Amino acid sequence: DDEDSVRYLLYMAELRYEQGNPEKAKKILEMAEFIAKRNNNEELERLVREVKKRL
């Protein structure tokens, strides 16, 4: 239900941050946040902000 698509994007933003690319990680995070806030699941947006605490 598109929830996996947010988890996929979140993992990518961590990798791009891990590889030392801060700009791409924010962009994938912006895309992951757009979809998450348009999903009916509230845990999805909780995970997004949690990942934002890691970046």
Residue numbers in the entry: 4 to 58
From the study:
The structure is that of a small (58 residues) engineered protein, LCB2, which was developed in Baker’s laboratory as a blocking ligand of the SARS-CoV-2 spike protein. It was envisioned that solutions of mini-proteins such as LCB2 could be used in the form of a nasal spray to confer temporary protection against the coronavirus infection. While LCB2 was validated by means of biolayer interferometry experiments and tested in cell culture assays employing live virus, it has not been developed further.
